[PDB]
Every structure is written in C-alpha cells, then in structure tokens.
Design a protein around this ligand. Structure first.
Ligand SMILES: CC(=O)N[C@H]1[C@H](O[C@@H]2[C@@H](O)[C@H](O)O[C@H](CO)[C@@H]2O)O[C@H](CO)[C@@H](O[C@@H]2O[C@H](CO)[C@H](O)[C@H](O[C@]3(C(=O)O)C[C@H](O)[C@@H](NC(C)=O)[C@H]([C@H](O)[C@H](O)CO)O3)[C@H]2O)[C@@H]1O[C@@H]1O[C@@H](C)[C@@H](O)[C@@H](O)[C@@H]1O
Ligand SMILES: CC(=O)N[C@H]1[C@H](O[C@@H]2[C@@H](O)[C@H](O)O[C@H](CO)[C@@H]2O)O[C@H](CO)[C@@H](O[C@@H]2O[C@H](CO)[C@H](O)[C@H](O[C@]3(C(=O)O)C[C@H](O)[C@@H](NC(C)=O)[C@H]([C@H](O)[C@H](O)CO)O3)[C@H]2O)[C@@H]1O[C@@H]1O[C@@H](C)[C@@H](O)[C@@H](O)[C@@H]1O
Ligand SMILES: *[C@@H]1O[C@H](CO)[C@@H](O[C@@H]2O[C@H](CO)[C@@H](O)[C@H](O)[C@H]2NC(C)=O)[C@H](O)[C@H]1NC(C)=O
Ligand SMILES: *[C@@H]1O[C@H](CO)[C@@H](O[C@@H]2O[C@H](CO)[C@@H](O)[C@H](O)[C@H]2NC(C)=O)[C@H](O)[C@H]1NC(C)=O
Ligand SMILES: *[C@@H]1O[C@H](CO)[C@@H](O[C@@H]2O[C@H](CO)[C@@H](O)[C@H](O)[C@H]2NC(C)=O)[C@H](O)[C@H]1NC(C)=O
Ligand SMILES: *[C@@H]1O[C@H](CO)[C@@H](O[C@@H]2O[C@H](CO)[C@@H](O)[C@H](O)[C@H]2NC(C)=O)[C@H](O)[C@H]1NC(C)=O
Ligand code: NAG
Ligand code: NAG
Ligand code: NAG
Ligand code: NAG
Lengths: 452, 452
C-alpha cells in the first residue's frame, strides 16, 4: 500500500478552486457520513483537544492531545498522531483512510503541537510543558522545543531544537496549533511566544504596531491615541508585559536530522499580537492564518513571503487581506463586539480556507471568498456554523447541530475531485459530546456547490 | 511492526481469571482514557451499529456497519473492519492500537457481520441483504453467505459459500453478530435463521424444545401446557412460523480458500429459539452466548463441545449454565419481567465475559462470576450499566453516563496483565450520541478489582 491519495484528488489539493475573480453564490451540502478518522476519548471526562491537520498532495497528517483527566490538569498529556490517504467509496465521496498511527505516551507533556505533511510521513513541532502558560511568560528561558519525524516505514525520530534567534530574546515560545508546510526544501511551522522587552529583538521591535480598521465599523478616537493603544496591546500584563509575538520556525529539510532551525520574526507593523496560527501553501503562494487572540475580532489571513539567507538573517514580509465579515467570541473587553485596540488575551482558533486568490499576477481580487467553521456568538464558544464568506459579508451559513451546542477549535481544508469536479471541504471541529466529554473532534466532510 | 500484542498480555488472554472456586467481591474502576479505536459517524444522523470484536493472543479484530442515512432502510451499508494490537501506555494501562483498516464499500449490503481472529488477520462472516428480514423468513431460499479474509499483508479475499446442510433446509440464515473463534484448525461462527418445517431438518427437530425455569421466579402453570407453549415459541408468526434456529458455521481453516464449510445445528432440547450469539474459547473450553430474543429474559451462556466428522455429520453438545441474575429489556409480553413461554422476537445483544469456569474436572463451580454491560430497564434500551454478576444475583453495578442515556448492543472482553496482575475489561457499547447520532460504539476500558 503506497502512501498515495486516490489519483482523482492529487491535482485538486492546495489549489485555488475559484480563479475567475467573479462573484459567486454558495451552498454547503449536508455532512457526508463515513468512519471518522479522528479518535474520540474513551471516558466521559477525559480531555481531547487541540487538533492539527494537513492534507498534502499524496497523503494527510493529523494530531491532537489526550489527557486522562479533566482539561484543567497538570500531570501530563499524550499526543495522538496519524497519517493516511483519501479513498473514494461507493457512497460517491472520499473518506480518510488511516494508514499509520503513533500514540506518543511516555510521560512527556508535549503541548500545543503543530503537524505538517512531509515526504513519506509527518513532522510535528511541540514544546514540553512543565508549568502554567503564564509561568512561561513570567520566566526568562523558553521551554524545551521538540521536533518529531514520523515516517511510513514506522521510523520515529525526536530531537530537541534551539532555533537561531531563540536564546536570549524570548521568555517562551510554543507552536501555533496549526499545520505547517513543506515548501522549497523548507519545513515551516507557525509559532508564537513572549519576547523579552529589554533583549536585542525587543529593542529592535519596540515601536512596531499594526492597527487594522474596519471602514464600516470604525473605532472612535484620534489617530495618535488609537495608535498608542494598539501598540500597548502587544504587551498584556496577563503575560507579564512581554511582547507577545508571532514567528515562524524554519528548518532545512535536507538537514532535518542535524539542523537547529531558525526563528523568522515578522515586523509587528504588518501583524497583530502573537497568537496561534497556520501556514498554507496554495498555488505555490504562502498564506498565514493568525488567531484573533488580540482586540481585533475579525478573521486574520496574510499573504506572506520569505527571503532566505545562508547566515541566519532570513526575513518574512506579510500583507494583510482586509477581512471584516464575521467576528470570533471573546470575553470582557475582547468580545466579538469590540473593535478598539486594547490589551487582550482572548478569542479562539478558527482558521479559514481561501477558495480564491487575493493578489494575483494581474491585480487584486476584491471578490475574495473563504470558507470555514465559526462560532455564532460574541462571548461564548458555542453554535458551530459552517460558512462561506466574502471580504465584507457572509455568503452562506449552515449550523452544525442544535443551538446551544458548545464548540471550540475549528480547522478547515478544501480540495477538489478532478474526476467529477466535486469540491469537498472538511471542517474539523472541537464539539462538546454528551458521552465523551470535552470535545469529540469531528471531521465534517461536505460538498460545496458554487454557482453564479 | 509485527502483529503481536505486548508480551505482558499474551498469556493473560482467553484465560479464566478466577480459578479458586471461592466467593469474591468486585469493584469496577473508572473508564481509562485513550484514543478510541472504534470510529464514530461523521454526520448527525448516519447509522453506525452492530459491533463485533475478538481479542486473540497476538492481536484483535473488530468490525461494524455504517449507513450514510438513517438506520431505517437505505438498503445500502458499508462494513468497517480493523485489526490491531495491545500496547501499554505511560498512563499505566494498555490501549488498542489499530494497525490495519479496511472499509468495504462496494454497494453490497453486507449485514449482521461476525468477526474472528485468525492467523495473520481476521475472518468475517456476513450475509448480503436485499430485502427485509421478515421477507427473508417468509421466503424459501436463504440469502447470499459471504466469507471475507483480511490479512496483515493487505490481502483481502471474499468468497460466496454454501455450507453443507443449508440448501433445502433453511428459508434464511445470517451470522450471529458475535465474534467467532479459531480453534483446532476450525473457524467457528455463530449463526441463526429460519428452518423450513417441512424439510428434513424441520421434521427431524419438530418436537425439540427447551423450557428453562428460574427457581426463584417460576412461571405458574402445568408442565405439559407450559411445554407446549415453549415448543410453539420457536415458531413466531413474525418470522412466518419457521423454526427459528441457532447454528454454527464451521470451516476447515486449512482448506479455507476452497471449502464450503458446514452447518452444525444444536438440539433444541438444549437451546432456546435461534438468535444472535457469540462463540468463546477460554482455557480450551468452548462457550456459546445466546441473545435472549425469545421469552426467557435472563443471560444465556452454554458450555459447548463439538464432535467433528469427515463426512459432514458433525454434532454439537450444549450445556446451559443456570443464570437468573438480571433481565434484558423487551417489549409487550416479552419484557424483562416476563418469564413464561410465549412467542417472542424481542430483546437485545448483551454478551457476558465469564471470569470463572463453571464445569471443571472435579465438579461444578457454584461461585460462577461473569461481567458485562446491561441495560437497566425491563422495557427500553436505556441506562447502560457495567456489572459483575454471580449466578443468582448482581455483585456490583457501575452506570455509564446519566440516567436516561439510550444504549443498545454491548460486547465485553476481559484479559489480564501478567506483569502487574491487572485485570482489564473492555465494554464495547452502542451509545446514543448528541452529535453523531444513533450509537457511537464506545470501547470503555476499566480495571477490575477482585477481593475476598
Ligand atoms: C479566571 C479566568 O477566566 N482566567 C482566564 C484569563 O482571563 C484573563 C483575565 O483574568 C485578565 O485580567 O485579563 C486577560 C486579558 O488581558 C484575560 O482575560 O484569560 C486566559 C486567556 O484566555 C484564560 O485561559 C484560557 O482558558 C480557556 C478556557 O476556556 C482555554 O483553556 C485557553 O486555552 C487555549 C484555548 O484557547 O482553548 C488552548 C491551549 O491550551 C492554550 N495554549 C497554551 C500553550 O497554553 C491556548 C493559549 O492560552 C492561547 O493561544 C493564548 O496564548 O489557548 C486558555 O488560554 C483564563 O482562563 C483560566 O485559565 C485557563 C488556563 C483555564 O484553566 C481556564 O479554565 C481558567 O478559567
Ligand atoms: C412495528 C414494530 O415495532 N415492529 C417490531 C417488531 O414487533 C413485532 C410485533 O409487531 C408483533 O406483533 O410481534 C412480534 C413478536 O412475535 C414483534 O414484537 O419486532 C421486531 C423485532 O424485535 C422489530 O424489529 C427490530 O427493530 C429494532 C428497532 O429498535 C431493531 O432495528 C432490530 O434490529 C436488530 C436489533 O435488535 O437492534 C439488529 C439487526 O439489524 C437485526 N438483524 C437482521 C439480520 O435484520 C436484528 C434481528 O432483527 C434480531 O436478531 C431478530 O432476529 O435485530 C429489529 O429486529 C420491529 O421493529 C420494526 O422493524 C425494524 C426492522 C425497524 O424498522 C424498526 O424501526 C421497526 O419499528
Ligand atoms: C525510513 O524513511 C526515512 C524517510 O524516507 C528514511 O530516512 C532517510 O534515510 C536516508 C538514508 O539513506 C538519509 O540519507 C536521509 O537523510 C533520511 N531522511 C530523513 C528525513 O530522515 C529512513 O532511512 C527509512 N528507514 C528505513 C528504510 O529503515
Ligand atoms: C511587503 O508587504 C507589504 C504589505 O504589508 C507591501 O506593501 C504594500 O504594497 C502594495 C503594492 O506595492 C501597496 O498597494 C500597499 O499600499 C503596500 N502597503 C503598505 C502598508 O506599504 C510590500 O510591497 C511588500 N514588500 C516589501 C518589500 O515590503
Ligand atoms: C498474505 O497472507 C496470507 C495468509 O498468511 C497468505 O495466504 C497463504 O498463501 C500460501 C501461498 O500459496 C498458501 O499456500 C496458503 O494456503 C495461504 N493461506 C491462506 C489461509 O489463505 C498469502 O499468500 C499472503 N499474500 C502475499 C501476497 O504474501
Ligand atoms: C450433552 O449435553 C448435555 C446437557 O444438555 C449433558 O447432559 C448432562 O450430563 C450431566 C452429567 O452426565 C448430567 O448431570 C445432567 O443431568 C445432564 N443434563 C441433561 C439435560 O441431560 C451431556 O452429558 C452432554 N453429552 C456429552 C457426551 O458430554
Ligand atoms: C514600523 O513603523 C514605525 C512607525 O509606526 C516606523 O518608525 C518603523 O520604521 C517601522 N519599522 C518597520 C520595520 O517597518
Ligand atoms: C446566529 O444565529 C442566529 C439565530 O439565532 C442567526 O439569525 C444569525 O444569522 C447567526 N449568525 C451567524 C454568523 O451564523
Ligand atoms: C428431545 O426431547 C424429546 C422429548 O421432548 C425426545 O423425544 C427426543 O428424543 C429428544 N431429542 C434429542 C436429540 O435429545
Ligand atoms: C437501575 O437503576 C435504579 C435507580 O433508578 C437502581 O435502583 C437499580 O439498582 C438499577 N439496576 C441495575 C441492574 O443497575
């Protein structure tokens, strides 16, 4: 059994499904039933959280975290990792056929793990948690960073890494809980953490800030006060006033057994407060989803591009796609109704799958469309809803379950059947279950109908 | 990766865990959390039912049935099959690691499938359903019988079989929805169906009947009238008054690619109306669980032994273990409170795992103990409850979930860790889920504490 998807999907993966730059109407089909490839808990009160999923050209990779006790717990966790392929069934649609399983259960508390599809298997970026996240940010030395390689030949290799730029500049660093990508001999993971304000990186980036504005819902105040507030929002006292910063872990794949990798840190003039995220490669164009952990409540997706150097001076340039369609739930001054800059550590991971390019060779596509799963609430993680959205407004909505159903993290991936032109989107959602407790992570496969 | 369980379980599988013949107290531990090896549905209203599970010395085999639509008809299903091993985790207990998956999805409605662990893989006995079960019993020719062999080398071989004794004697025959066994070059599956009363087998067994009596809850009436009612209870008009009959599909394993197998039919003087069942091999002793589909509401477990012939006249001996502990739910005059002979097609599959021998060379063990999952109701499939039970009474009870939780089929298997003497029982239960609908089949692994 080769680690190869069914041929009708190989050339419909990581492509822009809509490239006419025109307006379109959308319909989200009903969930297509199959044996779920994501295992649930086996107890009513075990914790099962933090999904990470990547569909590559030839196979997919998946992982999440399992705790034998309540989600509020400190002893340790375990990491379920799997890889598999897409197989067409006689029901008329594909299913995710698991081919390899690896349950990392050795007493090491690997946390916040991000997975990526690599030649012949998967790569996983974790940190080893030994204390509270707030303790991480209050300290001055980052936790242990681990890189795990899982191959189809059943080989597993785990290494501790110290990427260039980490030591001396960061109080803490964790993976972005969103899939990384394998791109031009580079393995790229999202990451975020706390930068020491007095360090070299802290002093260099001390005055960097980005303040997106919704023209239809502007924040009240003078430009200077809003800019000062947006700058202050990068240093929440909940995280000991560190500069909370997004970054990219970049590893040379050809040297993946010996390299320590490299931290590429974006300019905070182009990106908001560091948060969970995801790196996508569509039509050989790199995108970065950033969770709206800070005051800005709308969906954050950037077009990104790297400049790689031999000496360790790589850089990344980020370009925000102006999206103000829907808001994510948050608490206090950081709910979905807040649009003004303020110190926030709130929100929830909800990533988007872009169906259209935004920047193309001939210009910019204002008819941008993206799809995903949102939480229909401004304060609470509840009401999972499949959606297709434009830049300014929602195009179509389809709830999953009844109103009042609790849901948290969602990650969405779309691909096309090149045999019959069917467009499939899988919405992987943390759903509250009555029998397995905090989040059965469910992959809902639907067919997306696109018309004029 | 060899298809071999962790060594600490190899000699603790298919053994009698309690062999002192003494009285014991029991405590059922809390569910132990792990990634469930049984996939759920991926839609809120897809059907996922009919679990079959076998734990062999070196590996386990599992299967169940998946319908993209409601459990009511659709007349099209798929069969999920998996095989794997037991692996100890750092959490202190084993988990079930799936090593091979096979999703039979080709438009053939394989139904009521029974799985068995065989050298290098699994064997599955199904029938191809094309109409209602009542239509099967109303007809005069049994449906297609299929045998599927799945090996670790990823080879799948399916054959249509016509076992000796089937044609001319049966209106219909289906597998027993309980695991078969590989024993002395024989592959033995439970089965049941409808015998044509006018056929050779029908006239031979015309006066055979078994009427168990609970000495603590006897049915009132004369012996002869009750005997006539118990004889008539084998011919329900719901199944067109055929003789509903249990049987055993026996295949020569060395000739499994070419043999047609053989129907070994027990005497109905020793067994109740034909129903689903399970074949167990513990300490080289064969046992048969029979679902209480007929009027008798208590747990049916028989010690069985085969006499094999070369010419096709094999026979089976059945010896009922007298159990009157708890009752299964049923409707109408066939509820758990009915103990009088009457025509019944009711009940639910709930099989037992015996912890002790019943018959041994020196005598009979009155301190028999067995464990499983029951439904705490006399009329409704609701309130799944783990239990340890003696012959006459329940020793310990532990509900799963809240009162009012709907549950149907349960199958239980226990094994022992020979490293630390831990006794583990897995209770595989069809549970009603709020997000994946009719029955997430959940494997609940618990530790069983046994004292004096
Ligand atoms: C008492 C309380 O509610 N505390 C919150 C905390 O509130 C504070 C205020 O007290 C303070 O004054 O102001 C700040 C804003 O400046 C803030 O509002 O906010 C915490 C951050 O949201 C929150 O922790 C979060 O709890 C939720 C529970 O719903 C969840 O566990 C979050 O975790 C996840 C997630 O978003 O689901 C998942 C991962 O485990 C996290 N990764 C890591 C590496 O830890 C990830 C991560 O935190 C984010 O990406 C941000 O970096 O988020 C928590 O972040 C406090 O909630 C309490 O503490 C939690 C640890 C948990 O025990 C909750 O049950 C508590 O109520
Ligand atoms: C209208 C109704 O309720 N009909 C029942 C039927 O009731 C009749 C009475 O109407 C009649 O007067 O008297 C007889 C007794 O003489 C009987 O009570 O009983 C049927 C049997 O119990 C029942 O079918 C069962 O329905 C349940 C639904 O809860 C379930 O689908 C059962 O299936 C299973 C099971 O036990 O869960 C599983 C397998 O699919 C079955 N195997 C095969 C090969 O088909 C297996 C099998 O039937 C048993 O092992 C018996 O051999 O049982 C059904 O058996 C009737 O329910 C209706 O018909 C169902 C098919 C379904 O459509 C229900 O929704 C209907 O109400
Ligand atoms: C299992 O597969 C991995 C990846 O395909 C193999 O790893 C490579 O092995 C060669 C040895 O010739 C090295 O030069 C490469 O650098 C390795 N790549 C990585 C990413 O580690 C591994 O050898 C295989 N193991 C087997 C076949 O036993
Ligand atoms: C890096 O990304 C930024 C976006 O943040 C690019 O700047 C934009 O460029 C386009 C096209 O040239 C202009 O229409 C925008 O007005 C620019 N925005 C800003 C804020 O300057 C930039 O071109 C990219 N490349 C480099 C080298 O900076
Ligand atoms: C896969 O495994 C099965 C079972 O281990 C193999 O089946 C045997 O193959 C030999 C080779 O001719 C036969 O003589 C036996 O009778 C087969 N046994 C059974 C039970 O079928 C099969 O050959 C293996 N396939 C491959 C490709 O290696
Ligand atoms: C066939 O099974 C029957 C059980 O139905 C066995 O009969 C029992 O035998 C024991 C010991 O000989 C007696 O104490 C019981 O009274 C018998 N019960 C009945 C109902 O007859 C019988 O021994 C079995 N045959 C063989 C050869 O083992
Ligand atoms: C960031 O923006 C500030 C103005 O707010 C400017 O002074 C600084 O040079 C910018 N830095 C970068 C790297 O763009
Ligand atoms: C949220 O649900 C309400 C129904 O109570 C509906 O009117 C609204 O459109 C939904 N919003 C989103 C973003 O799904
Ligand atoms: C079954 O019992 C009847 C009496 O009810 C008897 O005549 C018959 O011989 C018995 N058959 C067997 C096989 O035990
Ligand atoms: C069923 O539940 C009731 C509580 O309503 C309890 O009294 C009874 O013992 C339970 N029976 C079993 C067999 O669990």
């Amino acid at each position: 059994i080769p680690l190869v998807n069914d041929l009708r999907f190989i050339n419909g993966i990581n492509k822009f499904i809509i490239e006419d730059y025109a307006t379109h109407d959308f319909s989200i089909g009903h969930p297509l039933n199959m044996p779920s490839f994501i295992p649930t808990a086996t107890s009513p009160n075990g914790c099962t959280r933090i999904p990470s999923f990547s569909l590559g050209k030839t196979h997919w990779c998946y992982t999440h975290n399992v705790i034998n006790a309540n989600c509020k717990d400190h002893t340790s966790s375990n990491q379920y990792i799997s890889m598999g392929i897409l197989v067409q069934t006689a029901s008329g649609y594909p299913m995710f056929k698991t081919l390899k399983i690896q349950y990392l259960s050795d007493g090491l508390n690997r946390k916040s793990c991000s997975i990526a599809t690599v030649p012949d298997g998967c790569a996983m970026y974790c940190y080893v948690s030994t204390q509270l996240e707030t303790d991480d940010y209050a300290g001055s030395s980052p936790p242990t960073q681990k890189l795990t390689l899982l191959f189809y030949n059943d080989t597993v290799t785990e290494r501790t890494i110290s990427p260039t730029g980490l030591e001396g500049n960061w109080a803490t660093l964790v993976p972005g809980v969103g899939s990384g990508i394998y791109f031009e001999n580079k393995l790229i993971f999202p990451a975020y953490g706390g930068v020491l304000p007095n360090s070299t990186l802290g002093v260099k980036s001390a005055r960097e800030f980005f303040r997106p504005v919704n023209p239809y819902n502007p924040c009240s105040g003078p430009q200077q006060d809003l800019d000062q507030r947006a700058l202050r929002s990068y240093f929440p006292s909940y995280f000991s006033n560190r500069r909370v910063q997004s970054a990219f872990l970049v590893c040379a794949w050809n040297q993946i057994l010996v390299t320590n990798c490299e931290l590429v840190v974006p300019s905070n003039n182009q990106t908001l407060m560091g948060a969970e995220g995801r790196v996508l490669l569509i039509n050989n164009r790199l995108l970065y989803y950033q969770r709206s952990t800070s005051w800005w409540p709308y969906e954050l997706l950037y077009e990104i591009s790297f400049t790689f150097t031999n000496s360790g001076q790589s850089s990344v340039n980020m370009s925000w796609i102006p999206i103000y369609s829907f808001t994510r739930p948050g608490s206090g001054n950081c709910s979905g109704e807040n649009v003004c800059p303020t110190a926030c550590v709130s929100g929830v991971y909800l990533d988007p799958w872009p169906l259209t390019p935004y920047s193309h060779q001939s210009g910019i596509n204002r008819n941008f469309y993206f799809t995903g799963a949102l939480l229909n609430s401004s304060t609470t993680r509840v009401n999972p809803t499949l959606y297709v959205s434009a830049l300014n407004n929602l195009k179509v909505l389809a709830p999953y379950g009844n109103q009042g159903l609790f849901a948290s993290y969602t990650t969405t991936t779309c691909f096309q059947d090149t045999g019959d032109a069917s467009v499939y989107c899988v919405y992987i959602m943390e759903l509250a279950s009555n029998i397995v407790g905090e989040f059965q992570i469910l992959p809902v496969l639907t067919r997306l109908t696109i018309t004029g």
